[PDB]
Amino acid sequence: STAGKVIKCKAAVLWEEKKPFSIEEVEVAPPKAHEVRIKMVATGICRSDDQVVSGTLVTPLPVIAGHEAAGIVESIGEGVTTVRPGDKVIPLFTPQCGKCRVCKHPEGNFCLKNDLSMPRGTMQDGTSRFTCRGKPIHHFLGTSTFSQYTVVDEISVAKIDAASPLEKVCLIGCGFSTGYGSAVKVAKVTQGSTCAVFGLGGVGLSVIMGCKAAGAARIIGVDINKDKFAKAKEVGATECVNPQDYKKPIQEVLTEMSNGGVDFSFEVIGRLDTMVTALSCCQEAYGVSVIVGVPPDSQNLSMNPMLLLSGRTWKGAIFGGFKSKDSVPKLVADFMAKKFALDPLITHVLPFEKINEGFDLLRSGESIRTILTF
Amino acid sequence: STAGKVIKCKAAVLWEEKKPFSIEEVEVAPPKAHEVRIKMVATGICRSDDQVVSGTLVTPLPVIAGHEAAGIVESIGEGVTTVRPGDKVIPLFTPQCGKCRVCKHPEGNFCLKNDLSMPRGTMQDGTSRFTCRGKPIHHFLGTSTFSQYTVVDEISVAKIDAASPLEKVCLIGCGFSTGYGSAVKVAKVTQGSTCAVFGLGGVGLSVIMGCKAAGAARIIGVDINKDKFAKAKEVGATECVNPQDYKKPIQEVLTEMSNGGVDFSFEVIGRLDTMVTALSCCQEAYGVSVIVGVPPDSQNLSMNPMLLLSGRTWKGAIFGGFKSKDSVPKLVADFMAKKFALDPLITHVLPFEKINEGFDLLRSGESIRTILTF
Ligand SMILES: NC(=O)C1=CN([C@@H]2O[C@H](COP(=O)(O)OP(=O)(O)OC[C@H]3O[C@@H](n4cnc5c(N)ncnc54)[C@H](O)[C@@H]3O)[C@@H](O)[C@H]2O)C=CC1
Ligand SMILES: NC(=O)C1=CN([C@@H]2O[C@H](COP(=O)(O)OP(=O)(O)OC[C@H]3O[C@@H](n4cnc5c(N)ncnc54)[C@H](O)[C@@H]3O)[C@@H](O)[C@H]2O)C=CC1
Ligand SMILES: O=CNC1CCCCC1
Ligand SMILES: O=CNC1CCCCC1
Numbered sequence: 001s002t003a004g005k006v007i008k009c010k011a012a013v014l015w016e017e018k019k020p021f022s023i024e025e026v027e028v029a030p031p032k033a034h035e036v037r038i039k040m041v042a043t044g045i046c047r048s049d050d051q052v053v054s055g056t057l058v059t060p061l062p063v064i065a066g067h068e069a070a071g072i073v074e075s076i077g078e079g080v081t082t083v084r085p086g087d088k089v090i091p092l093f094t095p096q097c098g099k100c101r102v103c104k105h106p107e108g109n110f111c112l113k114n115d116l117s118m119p120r121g122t123m124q125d126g127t128s129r130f131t132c133r134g135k136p137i138h139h140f141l142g143t144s145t146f147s148q149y150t151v152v153d154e155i156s157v158a159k160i161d162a163a164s165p166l167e168k169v170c171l172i173g174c175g176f177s178t179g180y181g182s183a184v185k186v187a188k189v190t191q192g193s194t195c196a197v198f199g200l201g202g203v204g205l206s207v208i209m210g211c212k213a214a215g216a217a218r219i220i221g222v223d224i225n226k227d228k229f230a231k232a233k234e235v236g237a238t239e240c241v242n243p244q245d246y247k248k249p250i251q252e253v254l255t256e257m258s259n260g261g262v263d264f265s266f267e268v269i270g271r272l273d274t275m276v277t278a279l280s281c282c283q284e285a286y287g288v289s290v291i292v293g294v295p296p297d298s299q300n301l302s303m304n305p306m307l308l309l310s311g312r313t314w315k316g317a318i319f320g321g322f323k324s325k326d327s328v329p330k331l332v333a334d335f336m337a338k339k340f341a342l343d344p345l346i347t348h349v350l351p352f353e354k355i356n357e358g359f360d361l362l363r364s365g366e367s368i369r370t371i372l373t374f
Numbered sequence: 375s376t377a378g379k380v381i382k383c384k385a386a387v388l389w390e391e392k393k394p395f396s397i398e399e400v401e402v403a404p405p406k407a408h409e410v411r412i413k414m415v416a417t418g419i420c421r422s423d424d425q426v427v428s429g430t431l432v433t434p435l436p437v438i439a440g441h442e443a444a445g446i447v448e449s450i451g452e453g454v455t456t457v458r459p460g461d462k463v464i465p466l467f468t469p470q471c472g473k474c475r476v477c478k479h480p481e482g483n484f485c486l487k488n489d490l491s492m493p494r495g496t497m498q499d500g501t502s503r504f505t506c507r508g509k510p511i512h513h514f515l516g517t518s519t520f521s522q523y524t525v526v527d528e529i530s531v532a533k534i535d536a537a538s539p540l541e542k543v544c545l546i547g548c549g550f551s552t553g554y555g556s557a558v559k560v561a562k563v564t565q566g567s568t569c570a571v572f573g574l575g576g577v578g579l580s581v582i583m584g585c586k587a588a589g590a591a592r593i594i595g596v597d598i599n600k601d602k603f604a605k606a607k608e609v610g611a612t613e614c615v616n617p618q619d620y621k622k623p624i625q626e627v628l629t630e631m632s633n634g635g636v637d638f639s640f641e642v643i644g645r646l647d648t649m650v651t652a653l654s655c656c657q658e659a660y661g662v663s664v665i666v667g668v669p670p671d672s673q674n675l676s677m678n679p680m681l682l683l684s685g686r687t688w689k690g691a692i693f694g695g696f697k698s699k700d701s702v703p704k705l706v707a708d709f710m711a712k713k714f715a716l717d718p719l720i721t722h723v724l725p726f727e728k729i730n731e732g733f734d735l736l737r738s739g740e741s742i743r744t745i746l747t748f
């Protein structure tokens with residue numbers, strides 16, 4: 001019926017920085033070879049989507065943002081083999097081509113087909129499937145989930161269990177997997193360790209979940225918003241600290257609290273100052289610090305390399321280090337088998353048409369994840 | 375009989391920065407409880423000792439420098455159990471107390487009794503065993519090997535094989551173990567990998583030996599002094615590049631040479647700029663960069679944390695990550711078993727009285743290791 005035809009549908013178009021999204025009709029072209037058109041069912045509001053509006057995460061405008069989502073395949077282009085119409089799918093903002101040197105590496109996940117390092121805001125073929133007011137509109141990270149329909153490359157979609165609750169498992173497309181994999185796969189948090197988690201939003205709470213799963217003895221949440229502390233303790237924080245409470249820099253506080261520095265620290269905010277603070281607070285000889293937060297475009301940090309020479313390890317990761325297309329269906333299977341909880345991350349639910357209210361909730365500090373339903 | 379008595383002997387005293395060493399008579403106190411007085415046999419000239427002269431490595435002056443050495447125990451203080459008079463020994467500039475949280479950690483070696491982080495230039499008890507022209511003279515890293523006799527704490531000395539050649543194994547006290555362990559223990563270089571080594575002095579050549587032992591397929595040496603390239607190839611470099619030969623920054627050259635970035639990079643120089651270049655030239659998703667060189671005191675580097683967010687790992691280490699008192703005897707045993715070579719690091723052998731000439735050979739580019747013999 002709609003196969004092979006342009007679909008006219010509602011999307012949230014961002015015409016310029018620092019403005020509300022515009023909910024209006026777009027034209028969604030049918031999928032080309034090795035492309036998949038998806039009817040969206042639910043999408044989450046991640047701070048990365050806000051960063052696009054703030055201009056601190058740079059991608060070409062105008063754009064259809066959104067990258068944390070789940071839906072149902074509407075149609076497949078020629079040569080698609082890994083999904084079919086009617087399949088439940090999660091779009092992958094980090095693709096998995098399976099062919100590049102990264103995809104073939106045992107540890108690597110940052111596939112060389114990504115649109116994150118040098119964003120074009122297109123499909124793999126360097127064109128757009130979106131028109132609004134007769135003007136072409138950019139894609140975002142090969143996903144663009146703030147639309148009733150989107151088109152993605154095959155390497156940017158995973159088929160998931162037919163019985164999964166899409167209004168929950170959408171968080172596996174970004175914030176849960178990112179935080180959980182940061183702890184269990186990138187840091188490799190050990191049993192009995194002391195962790196510090198900087199930032200207690202959806203992604204930091206998922207890092208806590210991962211530290212708890214790994215058997216950490218102490219999980220210290222760090223946030224300047226003390227309203228975040230109760231939920232951080234519910235999902236495994238053993239104690240919470242607000243830097244604003246202290247006369248001393250928090251790295252010194254966390255060093256004293258952990259009797260010489262923590263085993264593992266995580267920056268889950270996106271500030272240069274807290275990336276350096278998080279490295280400093282891990283133990284100088286054997287500590288590991290993981291950058292998860294996305295820092296402001298084109299800005300450098302300053303740091304003393306003696307922090308590394310003593311023995312620290314500093315690393316970062318996209319999407320929790322997970323190879324996206326292998327990992328997402330397994331993560332959904334694990335959720336279905338009650339291996340981790342998503343409900344603690346979901347604080348608010350809104351129809352897609354109230355997207356701007358959803359972004360107001362995040363910016364106020366009130367929400368963790370708002371899930372938008374189409 | 376010198377046991378229990380002050381020894382008057384020859385030492386190389388550094389009275390102030392940027393001056394030659396003064397070869398003169400010093401007084402060496404007998405060892406107190408848990409102290410060891412050593413007759414030195416051979417000591418190497420390490421760039422770290424030159425950095426004390428330059429003022430880029432800060433330690434209290436005046437000082438008896440020297441940390442890369444081997445000698446024979448002359449006498450032991452009360453309570454000493456791990457060495458005896460007549461034993462061959464290597465002083466440990468990183469101690470191994472065996473009791474602190476680091477010494478008990480499987481991957482830590484930066485023992486909390488170290489005199490590196492906040493240098494006092496004393497014995498563990500906060501006093502000095504050296505006087506010269508009626509003035510107290512500081513110790514350096516708890517070793518001070520530019521002296522016919524030194525006194526060290528027991529946790530800063532290892533017993534080695536009675537048959538070892540001290541004019542070669544002195545290098546296990548610093549440069550060989552530092553570079554070799556940076557490759558095999560800290561980086562954990564893999565078989566078939568591509569490595570880049572910035573700086574082809576004694577420590578960088580030892581990194582190359584460790585990358586070769588680990589089965590690297592490609593080992594790219596990087597030095598501005600092309601006279602360093604022949605020896606780097608002898609010990610395992612597959613190609614050498616001089617940044618000065620290129621119009622482009624060398625991180626771009628090494629990324630192209632390695633078809634998208636190296637597996638492992640090592641900074642073995644001590645410059646902030648080359649620390650950032652070495653991080654940048656490792657593959658952005660799964661690369662590992664190790665800081666070995668000592669940067670200039672109190673200077674910060676500037677870097678874009680997106681280099682880490684993509685998946686890089688950045689770490690540093692002291693003494694190749696080896697727990698010093700456990701590892702040094704085993705390394706000497708391995709040298710005796712022909713598991714690695716030290717002769718390729720030794721370009722010059724001078725009597726101790728020619729220490730200044732040795733330092734001039736290093737500064738001029740002409741030497742790798744000069745060994746001074748007492
Ligand atoms: N590496 C990756 O693959 C991913 C990265 N990100 C990034 O992770 C970060 C966190 O994302 P969300 O959890 O959605 O954001 P969020 O805004 O809900 O959470 C961040 C938290 O940081 C706290 N915070 C702000 N300034 C702080 C300070 N100076 N000190 C201590 N706490 C402070 C806030 O109060 C807030 O609770 C953002 O930068 C986001 O762009 C998100 C997902 C994927
Ligand atoms: N982490 C640790 O435990 C240890 C650190 N050190 C440090 O390791 C470094 C190397 O020590 P050595 O091998 O004894 O020094 P070295 O001076 O013999 O070798 C340094 C090499 O770097 C090259 N170089 C200088 N500027 C360069 C540039 N801009 N680009 C490329 N090459 C450049 C020189 O030409 C030279 O061959 C020093 O900073 C020293 O203090 C040494 C031993 C222990
Ligand atoms: O939140 C999802 N993706 C982020 C990942 C980090 C780089 C910017 C985009
Ligand atoms: O070369 C020997 N030791 C160095 C180790 C790093 C700090 C300066 C001292």
Ligand SMILES: [Zn+2]
Pocket residue numbers: 046047048049067068174175
């Ligand atoms: Zn996200």
Ligand SMILES: [Zn+2]
Pocket residue numbers: 095096097098099100101102103111112113
């Ligand atoms: Zn790929």
Ligand SMILES: [Zn+2]
Pocket residue numbers: 469470471472473474475476477485486487
């Ligand atoms: Zn110790």
Ligand SMILES: [Zn+2]
Pocket residue numbers: 420421422423441442548549
């Ligand atoms: Zn040295």
